[PDB]
Design a protein around this ligand. Structure first.
Ligand SMILES: [Zn+2]
Ligand SMILES: [Zn+2]
Ligand SMILES: [Zn+2]
Ligand SMILES: [Zn+2]
Ligand SMILES: [Zn+2]
Ligand SMILES: [Zn+2]
Ligand SMILES: [Zn+2]
Ligand SMILES: [Zn+2]
Ligand SMILES: [Zn+2]
Ligand SMILES: [Zn+2]
Ligand SMILES: [Zn+2]
Ligand SMILES: [Zn+2]
Lengths: 274, 274, 274, 274
């Protein structure tokens, strides 16, 4: 084809980072996005590739991702500028055959490197691949304001957050029936937070980093963005509700169960407390 | 005429879904819109029609809508993408002569189907047709944040919500003098919630689904959007007011009555409590 | 010149109504704007004029505005659509020689008429003309959310609202040193509310209609928009502050006085209480 | 090159003022921005220069800035109009050889002058130049809503604000490890507030003017905007949290310290209280 910036994947990355920015979720360099691609996606654009792809080691060996190409956001790069200069804020990287490093085949100009949260992204892509038998292809991280605020007031427990978020918007249980995982606060950009994030991803498509943000997984950019957006929307309702003094009525456990049955999903049981 | 995407109705659907999305009311696939058309509206675009219109059964027979064409949003489709690809997110469907199903004459590509809330839409279109002698042509559903938040704190009663919303913005009583109906929480996408919604529509142009969202009816897209927007605006004022501790002063019952008289409307009497 | 839609005044009206709409201040038909023009402003566009200008009587004789041309928003017209169709949502009207009615020389198509708040607009234009010796030319009304919310919690008194708003943003006393007038709630679209609004305008460039909205006056669209925007910005800060429980510290009376002296303005003394 | 409006610096100024405006930080003329340029930046555009550059005295001699060119926003000019008319809202000024005044080489048409906050800008540019050995080139002021609201509730102390803001978003300590300085309220547009601002800038890249706004410094427009945006984002989380009643859990002192170590920064020690 022609210019890679016009491909479905770069256009998708631009739309996603732009919408998130417009959402007020990604100030400065807060936030990151990675989409797993097939060699066939990037092959039409061979002539756009760097002739001397820079090689970068991975924090730790990730053999299951060996030879896998991804389009990712850069380290210290603003979601806001992606639309202005895709190549400087986005990069297509390909993990080597041992899953010990990757080559930047396109983008990330001016010596830019992938997001410092790559361990969380790649390790999670790994688990989601196994959890969904290869369906999930996107890991998205954003600093969703209301979800962040809620982590300072709600008990930081998967059951608690899952249940309250399900209560904050009817469709939530249907969009993320597996619930929302939550980690204790951890130093970001480390293999440790990445591994802890991947662990939650074995079950949850959404994972919260208290006082920091949210991680989401999905089969497409649209579905992954929509997943986070649904959770942040519910979080937004909850913040207003808690600000008005709390709930006087809410969706009941039995209603939540009837909802799950109707849409054919199996909701995280431990969140059906009360 | 030329391309149907450029018609007044597709352009209207794009503007409406776009504005709502920009309002933060329709994350993911949350929300739906249906506009009743005349055969004469779509006739200029016969060449844009599908040659093998897919036929889909209705949840239940709706004889009064027999042979009626509508432009609707799709199931699992994002209001945000309508502007990007009208045909994939919008569909023109025509109810068959028995009102037992409909043919997708245009749009809803990739085997997409109309919103799973079609029962609520179509059944409500039915009642609104009878209630307004054919004037209403639009049923719109959106997840208006503040109205949703208010359903967890305000008593879920038509009189209560109508009165508080009328108090939250002066023009409210004039825009929806018939008040705001409210249902108990129910499983969405069912014939039951649809029928319950239609029942409220016999009188109210606005109906709330607690912990879920709002339904509105109107003669045009602009008026229907404006109706919901007016209710959500008042809801927004109320949330701030309740968050500041509550009202110290407000529009009085007598003032509300003087307002109704001045604009020649008969306000829902049961909401003129106090 | 060429098409009147491209004139400085129609372009200004489009920019102003658009920015306000984007501010979330003018849902549906909530809000209105009128700009006083000179015959010389509209003369270049004679060929754009209606050949059979519709004549409309005024609610009451306004002789000082005799022969004065204005560009106004229409009744039931949405600020949101002005940019889409200026002529259908905007109209240039000219008051007759007795100030007993006006001719619609351009716009307000489809038999549209000026805003039902014209009495408040025109009567206020009258007082502002006298108060500023002809400098003010714009009267703008919008449903500024936070200012509306504050009218349910703050004592509805000019001194109270002026003082709190001055405290909510440092530049406020400098932008509206004459303070903010406030009326008791009144039926909108009446000669009575219009006259009451004009009365406040003899001194205040900003006037609040409790549970309804705000009126502002200024020499240009930019200054008038900026005035309201400054007041709504301060109101927004106050709502957050009151929502967090109230102020622990604030700008003091002496600081407010030093501020007035520094910028050479005489702040409304009755608001320098405490 | 060609037209100066298309240069990297004017385009940068337009993007920055536009994004801020869209953020709701710069209503009316609230806010200002100055970027230090090299003669080499403006030399390609000599033909765009004013032939009779107006000379304006400085509030006080600033010898270290002698012969330095800057692009600044104008006094009483709206950030919103920069994109519409760069030359009328922006000006390139050059300080004379004694640092006693400056010539307006381009822009600031219609006899416009630089922001009345120029003393705060220039004096701060001075300190930041010394503090960063010439790396910082931008001083930005904006009326960030949430940060303003917080100044009425949080103790106006550098340690307090720094600590709470670091707690309100994980990356904060990493983006501004030197903390946030805060001044007592002072009359704006004076040499006194400017000098007090510069003093804080010797250490802090962010300085708060209680009940007024925020000042930020940085090497580029993007980094400076991002810095303020990160602080306002954290402030936004805090306002929601305080509105919900306060924090139940938060980032701990030890976690904040581990965070600083991991990213190789030395966080303001006096903010690591508790
Ligand atoms: Zn962040
Ligand atoms: Zn992050
Ligand atoms: Zn190859
Ligand atoms: Zn929703
Ligand atoms: Zn819904
Ligand atoms: Zn036909
Ligand atoms: Zn309104
Ligand atoms: Zn109004
Ligand atoms: Zn003439
Ligand atoms: Zn301000
Ligand atoms: Zn300022
Ligand atoms: Zn030269």
């Amino acid at each position: 084809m022609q210019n890679i910036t016009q491909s479905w994947f770069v256009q998708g990355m631009i739309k996603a980072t732009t919408d998130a920015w417009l959402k007020g979720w990604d100030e400065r360099n807060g936030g990151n996005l990675t989409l797993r691609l097939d060699d066939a996606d990037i092959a039409p654009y061979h002539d756009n590739f760097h002739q001397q792809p820079r090689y970068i080691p991975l924090s730790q060996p990730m053999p299951l991702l060996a030879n896998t190409p991804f389009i990712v956001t850069g380290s210290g790069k603003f979601f806001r500028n992606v639309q202005l200069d895709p190549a400087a804020n986005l990069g297509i990287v390909k993990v080597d055959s041992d899953g010990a490093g990757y080559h930047i085949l396109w983008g990330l100009t001016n010596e830019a490197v992938p997001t410092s949260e790559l361990p969380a992204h790649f390790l999670s892509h790994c688990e989601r691949i196994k959890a969904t038998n290869g369906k999930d292809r996107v890991i998205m991280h954003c600093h969703a304001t209301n979800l962040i605020a809620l982590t300072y007031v709600l008990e930081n427990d998967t059951a608690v957050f899952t249940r309250q978020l399900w209560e904050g918007s009817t469709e939530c249980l249907v969009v993320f029936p597996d619930g929302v995982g939550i980690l204790p606060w951890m130093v970001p950009g480390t293999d440790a937070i990445g591994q802890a994030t991947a662990q939650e991803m074995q079950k949850h498509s959404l994972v919260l980093w208290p006082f920091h943000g949210v991680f989401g997984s999905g089969p497409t950019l649209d579905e992954t963005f929509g997943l986070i957006d649904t959770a942040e929307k519910s979080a937004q309702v909850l913040v207003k509700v808690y600000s008005m003094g709390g709930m006087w009525q809410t969706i009941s456990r039995e209603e939540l169960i009837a909802l799950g049955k109707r849409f054919g999903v199996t909701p995280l049981a431990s969140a059906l407390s009360l």
